[PDB]
Design an enzyme around this catalytic site. Sequence first.
Site, short mmCIF file in Angstrom:
data_model
loop_
_atom_site.label_atom_id
_atom_site.label_comp_id
_atom_site.label_asym_id
_atom_site.label_seq_id
_atom_site.Cartn_x
_atom_site.Cartn_y
_atom_site.Cartn_z
N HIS A 140 17.58 47.78 39.40
CA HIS A 140 17.17 47.48 38.03
C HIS A 140 16.98 48.69 37.16
O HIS A 140 16.39 48.57 36.07
CB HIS A 140 15.85 46.75 38.05
CG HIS A 140 15.98 45.34 38.47
ND1 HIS A 140 16.33 45.00 39.76
CD2 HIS A 140 15.79 44.18 37.80
CE1 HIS A 140 16.33 43.67 39.86
NE2 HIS A 140 16.02 43.16 38.69
N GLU A 152 25.37 36.34 32.15
CA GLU A 152 25.65 37.48 31.27
C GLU A 152 27.07 37.48 30.73
O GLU A 152 27.30 37.61 29.54
CB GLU A 152 25.45 38.76 32.06
CG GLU A 152 24.03 39.07 32.44
CD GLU A 152 23.54 38.32 33.67
OE1 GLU A 152 24.38 37.71 34.43
OE2 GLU A 152 22.29 38.42 33.91
N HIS A 193 56.52 35.72 31.96
CA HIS A 193 55.96 34.75 32.89
C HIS A 193 56.52 33.45 32.42
O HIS A 193 56.10 32.92 31.38
CB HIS A 193 54.44 34.70 32.76
CG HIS A 193 53.73 35.99 33.07
ND1 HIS A 193 53.59 37.02 32.16
CD2 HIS A 193 53.13 36.43 34.22
CE1 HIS A 193 52.94 38.03 32.72
NE2 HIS A 193 52.65 37.70 33.97
N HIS A 232 56.12 32.37 38.69
CA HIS A 232 54.90 32.79 37.97
C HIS A 232 55.15 33.91 36.93
O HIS A 232 54.73 33.78 35.77
CB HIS A 232 53.79 33.28 38.93
CG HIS A 232 52.67 33.99 38.23
ND1 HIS A 232 51.65 33.30 37.62
CD2 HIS A 232 52.49 35.30 37.92
CE1 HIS A 232 50.87 34.16 36.98
NE2 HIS A 232 51.36 35.38 37.14
#
Lengths: 662, 662
Positions: A473, A411, A28, A263
């Site tokens: 859950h 999280e 890259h 890129h």
Amino acid sequence: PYDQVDQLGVNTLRTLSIDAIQRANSGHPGLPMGAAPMAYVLWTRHLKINPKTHMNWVNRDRFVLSAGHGSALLYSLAHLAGYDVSMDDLKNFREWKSNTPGHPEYGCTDGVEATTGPLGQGISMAVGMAMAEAHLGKKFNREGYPVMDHYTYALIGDGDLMEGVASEAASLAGHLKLGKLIALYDSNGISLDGKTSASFTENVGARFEAYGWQYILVEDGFNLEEIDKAIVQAKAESDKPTIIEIKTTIGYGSENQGTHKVHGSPLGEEGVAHAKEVYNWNYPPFTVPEEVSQRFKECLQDKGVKAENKWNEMFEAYKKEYSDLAQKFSDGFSNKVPNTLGDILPQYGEDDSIATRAASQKAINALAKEVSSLWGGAADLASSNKTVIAGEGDFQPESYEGRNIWFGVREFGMACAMNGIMLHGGTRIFGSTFFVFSDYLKAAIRLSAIQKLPVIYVLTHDSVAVGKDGPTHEPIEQLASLRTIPNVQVFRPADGNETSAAWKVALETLDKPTILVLSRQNLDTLPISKEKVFDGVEKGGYVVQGAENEADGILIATGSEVGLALKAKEELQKKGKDVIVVSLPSWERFEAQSEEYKNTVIPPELKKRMTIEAGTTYGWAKYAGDHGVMIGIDEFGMSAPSDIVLRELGMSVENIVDKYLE
Amino acid sequence: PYDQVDQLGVNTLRTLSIDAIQRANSGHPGLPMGAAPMAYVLWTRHLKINPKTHMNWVNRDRFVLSAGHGSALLYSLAHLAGYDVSMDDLKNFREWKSNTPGHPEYGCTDGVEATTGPLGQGISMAVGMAMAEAHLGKKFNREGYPVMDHYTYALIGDGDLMEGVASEAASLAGHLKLGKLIALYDSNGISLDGKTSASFTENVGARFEAYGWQYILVEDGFNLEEIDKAIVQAKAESDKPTIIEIKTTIGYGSENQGTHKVHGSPLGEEGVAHAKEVYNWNYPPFTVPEEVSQRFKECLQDKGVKAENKWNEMFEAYKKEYSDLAQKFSDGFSNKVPNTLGDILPQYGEDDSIATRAASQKAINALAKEVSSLWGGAADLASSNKTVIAGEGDFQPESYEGRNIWFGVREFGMACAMNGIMLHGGTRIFGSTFFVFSDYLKAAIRLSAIQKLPVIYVLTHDSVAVGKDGPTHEPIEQLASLRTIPNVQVFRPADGNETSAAWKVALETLDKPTILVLSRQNLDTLPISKEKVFDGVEKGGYVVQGAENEADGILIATGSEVGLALKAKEELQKKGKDVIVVSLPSWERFEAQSEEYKNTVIPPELKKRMTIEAGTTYGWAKYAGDHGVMIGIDEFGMSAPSDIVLRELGMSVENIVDKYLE
Ligand SMILES: Cc1ncc(C[n+]2csc(CCOP(=O)(O)OP(=O)(O)O)c2C)c(N)n1
Ligand SMILES: Cc1ncc(C[n+]2csc(CCOP(=O)(O)OP(=O)(O)O)c2C)c(N)n1
Ligand SMILES: [Mg+2]
Ligand SMILES: [Mg+2]
């Protein structure tokens, strides 16, 4: 302050990077060519490192390349900086067994502070690093002893900033006022598929100021002095992390510069030659101009040696005046734990009943007094995971010594920060949330495992027993999820004593993450001695109750289902069926044992087996075998009271007994 | 505009919600008590729905409660609105088999537009819904025929806004200028663990304006008219999605209001009575005051009937003037696909060789012409996943008809948007990224599966064959990850023809998500007829090459490893070993077949089996059996050239042959 030798240095980075890629026929080149000026200014004027000591100097500045695809630039830098990355190494980019891999790999390469292929995580981990610096600074620094005092730098691109996890981490960094964190943003208007104007037109500056970062714009990202002034300002603003947006031209030098085409692919022999024309660069491939190694020698290496030597002296003094403090500082960095974890940890009697989240909470409070390096927190679930470190403070700008981290509902950001904290060194981290939401942070667990970080994940509400909160859950497939990640250990303790043991093993395991999977509901204590449970958990699997004489069969279970298996062993005795009951709290720990030891727990000649776990059966045929039966849950759960869900989805003695007997 | 009957309505919501929770002894009363005023203003003045027709009116406004824990409020609303949610239902909150579960479940409850337990996803899915409205509006609306023209509303809390995925979705919404999306933000200064000032002090307003949203503040969130004026302004700003921050007191009425203590637990008999005093509410439990059902009848139900009846008439006209267009509009909503997918799809000859990402790309272009409802995109990886829909435009504010979505590096946000798009109805969506980064979006796949949405995930670079990009970009455990999620189908095609077939099955499967797992590298075409591959993929597993006569054994493989197994079958013939070769492109599809059919593919009496897949062995013992061998990869990979990685990690004919023969 900057001159033509400096620009030759910039274009040394550009050329090493592009030639490395060309020779690999893989890599890259856009980012190295766009971001060499920023990386060059940073590494030569603003990165307090000493490559002479590899990555052993605990108080070095931490650099993370979040845009991990710019690896070639990083190796190029590492080389010129004096790390153990040789020109030959650069010539082996992306080759089998090279220390110069396609994306940066912590542990592989001298000078690489983090494994950063997956976007957004690099910067999120730096947030971690910066959190630990701040926390240890406050714990251990004294008047005239800035023993932990260094910057954290992340180099990010447009990719990092589109990822949600990076938003979590910036939000949190902003809130914690990490004034020693500086992000350098290669803002080039290009992402992989094309222009950022097709997907990403937000106002980044403003977003970051809304987080409470300082924002600085470097209009001409090839101006070295302007990048330098910007960093100076970033450091001057010590009340806020700073992001410096540095406007850049991707692939500068290519006919294709300023497009996505540069890129991710080698430039091709003629693109290379073209970029070398633009740079007016007539050195041969893989060549450092002498003046450039000289300039790196002076700006970077000599200054690093002298900063470390000064730090080492100050640290000899610190050790004289604050002996006990310095000792804890070194124990933090070296992972010392007392020999007495076994007695420090709570122990539960045959008649006790406790939820393993709550046994976990008691392990945490007991350990926190004795293991001074421990800290951690919850993603806004401390009060439900039961991960509050009683009496030990809250981590906040006004109290960086506080040991409870309030990660918020973040999280993934939390897991990434844990990773950083561990990479930084000096502490033991744990973080918590619901097991079902381990999906939000899975990709960070992955990085824990790859980077070999003994991060401790505390994941509660481990099963359909959750009950009234319903299927979203209630975990089903998350044990599979985590167990299959290489280099992790996953413990699902069957009671209080197993939970303490697993915490012990978590602290003693230093080369992989340990994931503790815990119950909402109370579990009876297994009817056997603490000593036996500790030895058995240390081994990953063990017999809880043998057969009186010859075994009709064997039930193999984990967590809360070990108690079911014990009840069914009773019920089955009453039908002339004498079964072994095995707890297998960690498959990985179990499978790391000797063949000899494994065969004593699960006899290979015993074919009548049943496996029981409140989650998918996927995987269990390994232990159940051709002739076994698999008691588990291969569907989403339900909103109902706990005992009803368990009953309906077949976590019951009746169903276990019936299944055994057909 | 608002009066005391209206306030009684607000407190009807409050009381139904709190009593429901109290009677369940389970639930979250803070949010219902804080957010009833906003929800009441929205539902009575600003939600164009017709509960008389459940969720069949395609042009209704879409409401999503992202803060899914406010479920009781939602049921309360649903009840009063005229949905099929009865007072008895409210009285069965969180009870086994109730239609009023702890968190909202799409498909369970009349009027619930999305399953929103996991935070951040609800709003991210609404972004989806709004994207589809905009896309279909532009496709199908004509002068005097606003056939698709409706608002999308999400009600969010502090939790939703800390999650990264919600940041991805807002960024993207902002960029796409979804002026019909309005987010209502219950901004109460509280999260589960305590005050937001411990974790979340960012400037939300500013963040959202930086995304290109309009921001509006409702200082007094109990003022109905002020909330009403705000929504009116949100709708007036049709160039920008709008977020309305509505400052609120959590648990208003509790002694504990304005604290985290009212977040997640029943108030307790005395807290209820206390809140009823504050509300000056003397009705008995579970009672709607007549004036309140009257006010809902008039503001909401009567207006909904008349909006649908008008829409239905306009739609009869639309069908007259634009017959062919109206037909496509209905086919979109009803999932019609041509009978000719089998001939539309590309087919590959025994001598061809193609990477399955590239077969996928050709399926996409072939299908896009014939299936007008299809659209989709990539998380900035279209050009590498090969998911560009040639010639069909880019989805952008100036061209909402464009069919290529540019999601940016937003895997999770993308998956959530897909979910929304599917919940909305009217199209078939697909989205792509690297298989290894399925971890970023796993939790959304989970919701695809729970909500039964036939979202199509296209996940390329499926294995260590990726090679030079290294371990962070080489999947190991992600097949396990996805296969274990209940209600999904995961296909790993072994060649071009399998890839077309899997695309066909993906389009024909309407009740679960279909995940296509594809290769970077080229794969040879399996040496058998297209018709046989199509039938075999439809079944999930099938024999590629039988044994001449009696089978010594069987190799069972998936994807790129089917070609290895064919080569080892040859090599093994040359040692007097005649083996069956099975392709198992979908375990789930395979296991859904008859016992009879399964036994024909994998004979139960054949014990000498070997399983071969480039990923973990976890799970495979099911098929390999007691006596089988498991060829797979139970470690992270490496940066090296492709063929070297495969060889070193044992994906080779030599290793397969050797393993069989010991
Ligand atoms: C999580 C994740 N998703 C996707 C990728 C693949 N990828 C690598 S870089 C990139 C796009 C970012 O472009 P930018 O960061 O702006 O880099 P430039 O092209 O500007 O160097 C993508 C999608 C990744 N590495 N990690
Ligand atoms: C992804 C995810 N993580 C954690 C939870 C558990 N949880 C439910 S609500 C909440 C905190 C949010 O508080 P807020 O949204 O401000 O709601 P209020 O208490 O304001 O009603 C948490 C952590 C969740 N439901 N989903
Ligand atoms: Mg870029
Ligand atoms: Mg809140």
